[PDB]
Design a protein around this nucleic acid. Structure first.
Ligand SMILES: *OP(=O)(O)OC[C@H]1O[C@@H](n2cnc3c(N)ncnc32)[C@H](O)[C@@H]1O
Ligand SMILES: [Mg+2]
Length: 639
DNA sequence: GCTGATGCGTC
DNA sequence: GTCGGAC
DNA sequence: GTCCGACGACGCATCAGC
């Protein structure tokens, strides 16, 4: 067969057998994957990306089915099922050390180029071999080497990781090192992620079904259909995969089934079950009540307090075992021994199994009061012993996904909410149903929004009760709406802050500034104090304007009246002059930023939660910026 | 062991 | 988490 | 709307230099 360096999964009339660059039953070469990533990287149309990846996957299914699973994980840049918690434990620092060693270059040269180009991969492949090349990299080989890195732990493990990473680079050719480096830095940058990979996979197994005797008699099913019939058929097949995956987002479970039994029978084998994390329902932001009403204008809906904690998806298995997962399917069971011990107390005796959607919120037992998110994050994370817990939590339950052996994902929220209230028991400061309001009246919603904040919440979640009110993520992942005071114009906490530094952009921001350092004005000491960084809220056009206008203000050394304490040192110091209007959701007590240090806390300054750029204040000099005393005042009225 | 840095998670 | 670009 | 990847604060757990 042809050399993988000429593989072209973007060609017209791609034939899964004739246009593959490996022989049947052979390991998929990693360069075939890298070539597919190149062709994905080169386009902006996502559906073209899907087709290109689909072509590779069709060849994998037709020629080397054992390599489908590693190829898929490589395309997602995942190490495996998220609940198993494999982590590379490799930062850009370590990665740049491996690159500098492999390329025979000095480290600072490598670091400077990586900062300039905003991509470690561009440094790895653009940099006299006394040794003949090692065996070519394979898709399954590379994937297992990533997992080897992830399993290395303990003192001296970074040295062993560098050894593995160097061995990969020495074996790379053409564009492989580019995507090895990008995978290790956690920034594959394809423009193609989970939904595109699902679409490519369902299309692949539909056009080129697995399990065929080789050579496969059916390599492009549905070519003879009308465009509309073909499109409808692929959507239906796509929905089978998506709905299975949202209930069982674990390719270790789905792929063996898919290859052995096929896509049509997949839902019979992979089913939602307690102990298997599933995808949570998400929410779209809204600009105000009017947008909520428009989006739900044909459906009765309920409003619920949006509690400020961490999502906890609680699984009670038949027999008594309890599992708790985060919103990203991480295993949090070892984090909440206290919650596990109180499960028997939240449910009626008749409840044998369930899956609950809850928010875990820090709770002050002496004051009987919700505590801020920053208190909740001080809980320990791994293998916590119940007696050691110092920050108690209260569960605010808002949905019920599974009850007594029966999935409720296809039931309307009216029924799910009714079953939650009927089968579970509230205990103040331990397990409580989310406060809710059923109405369409603007004024009642506005007052309820105001009350939620008074009762220590972020705002409101809005959910339809009967129309399109299911828990089917595959039909719409953002089926709920969120309404926060800081989404409203002319409302929320707005600050005028001084730009004192800029950071070189990465990825989509390469070649300009991707972020900025902002500061408030400390009247008392006559100093500007870093308060937060800022990297969102500007259009691409606005960001070009900033790059041009700020370029003229770059300083070699920091000004003596600018204090940053623990903040990341800017790549470019800027003459303090530009004043920007900046919005945030809350002010936080910061362990690094000096703004307003000593005005609220002896040792801590203040930063901004969810800061975003709004507009330039061309009418403002730096002396007219928000003062540090004003920052302290804003923080204090948060209560 | 001591110290500071930092990867990855939560939002 | 927020946000804007591509479709 | 959907999908994606730029970017934010911040804290536990754990890394290396010494
Ligand atoms: O900001 P966001 O899109 O992540 O908001 C969604 C998150 O909000 C939390 N939350 C708190 N209270 C609720 C209720 N009542 N219903 C749904 N979600 C709620 C969740 O943790 C969710 O991830
Ligand atoms: Mg993880």
């Amino acid at each position: 067969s042809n050399d993988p360096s000429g593989y072209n999964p973007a060609k017209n009339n791609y034939h899964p057998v004739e246009d593959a660059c490996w022989k049947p039953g052979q390991k998929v070469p990693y360069l075939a994957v890298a070539r597919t990533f190149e062709k994905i990287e080169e386009v902006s149309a996502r559906l073209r990306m899907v087709e290109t990846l689909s072509n590779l996957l069709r060849s994998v299914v037709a020629l080397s089915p054992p390599d489908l699973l590693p190829v898929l994980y490589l395309s997602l840049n995942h190490l495996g099922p998220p609940q198993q918690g494999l982590e590379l434990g490799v930062g850009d620092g370590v990665l740049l050390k491996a690159v500098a060693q492999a390329t025979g270059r000095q480290l600072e040269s490598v670091r400077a180029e990586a900062a300039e180009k905003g991509d470690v991969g561009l440094v790895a492949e653009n940099s006299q071999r006394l040794m003949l090349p090692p065996p070519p990299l394979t898709a399954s080989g590379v994937f297992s080497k990533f997992r080897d890195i992830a399993r290395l732990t303990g003192s001296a493990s970074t040295a062993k990781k560098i050894d593995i990473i160097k061995g990969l680079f020495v074996a790379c050719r053409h564009s492989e090192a580019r995507f090895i480096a990008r995978s290790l830095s956690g920034r594959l940058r394809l423009g193609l992620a989970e939904q595109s990979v699902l679409a490519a996979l369902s299309q692949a197994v539909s056009l080129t079904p697995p399990g065929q005797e080789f050579p496969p008699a059916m390599v492009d099913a549905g070519k003879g259909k009308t465009a509309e019939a073909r499109k409808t058929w692929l959507e239906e097949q796509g929905m089978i995969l998506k709905q299975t995956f949202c209930e069982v987002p674990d390719l270790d479970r789905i792929i063996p089934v898919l290859l052995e039994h096929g896509l049509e029978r997949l839902p019979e084998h992979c089913k939602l079950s307690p102990g298997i994390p599933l995808k949570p329902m998400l929410a779209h932001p809204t600009r105000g009540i009017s947008e909520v009403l428009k989006r739900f204008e044909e459906a009765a809906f309920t409003c619920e307090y949006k509690y400020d904690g961490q999502r906890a998806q609680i699984h009670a298995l038949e027999g008594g075992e309890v599992k708790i997962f985060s919103r990203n399917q991480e295993d949090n069971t070892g984090k909440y021994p206290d919650i596990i011990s109180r499960i028997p107390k939240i449910k009626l005796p008749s409840v044998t199994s369930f899956i609950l959607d809850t928010e875990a919120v820090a709770w002050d037992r002496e004051k009987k009061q919700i505590q801020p998110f920053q208190v909740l994050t001080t809980r320990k994370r791994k293998e916590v012993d119940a007696s050691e817990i110092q920050v108690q939590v209260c569960l605010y339950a808002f949905d019920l996904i599974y009850l007594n052996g029966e999935s409720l994902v296809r039931e309307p929220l009216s029924r799910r909410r009714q079953l939650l209230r009927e089968n579970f028991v509230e205990t103040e400061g331990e397990f409580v149903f989310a406060t809710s309001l059923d109405t369409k009246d603007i004024e009642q919603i506005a007052e309820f929004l105001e009350q939620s904040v008074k009762d220590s919440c972020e705002g409101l979640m809005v959910k339809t009760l009967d129309v399109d009110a299911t828990y089917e993520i595959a039909k719409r992942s953002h089926n709920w709406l969120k309404l926060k005071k800081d989404y409203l114009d002319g409302v929320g906490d707005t600050l005028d802050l001084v730009v004192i530094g800029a950071y070189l952009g990465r990825g989509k921001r390469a070649g300009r500034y991707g972020g900025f350092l902002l500061a408030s004005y400390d009247e008392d000491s006559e100093e500007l104090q870093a308060i937060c960084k800022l990297g969102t809220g500007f259009s691409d056009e606005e960001l070009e304007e900033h790059h041009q206008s700020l370029k003229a203000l770059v300083l070699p050394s920091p000004r003596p009246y600018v204090r940053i304490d623990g903040a990341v040192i800017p790549d470019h110091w800027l003459d303090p002059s530009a004043v920007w209007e900046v919005k945030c959701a809350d002010l936080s007590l910061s362990p690094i930023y000096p703004a307003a240090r000593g005005l609220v806390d002896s040792d801590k300054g203040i930063s901004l939660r969810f800061p975003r750029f709004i507009r330039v204040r061309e009418d403002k000099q730096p002396e007219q910026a928000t003062t540090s005393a004003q920052v302290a005042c804003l923080y204090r009225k948060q209560s």
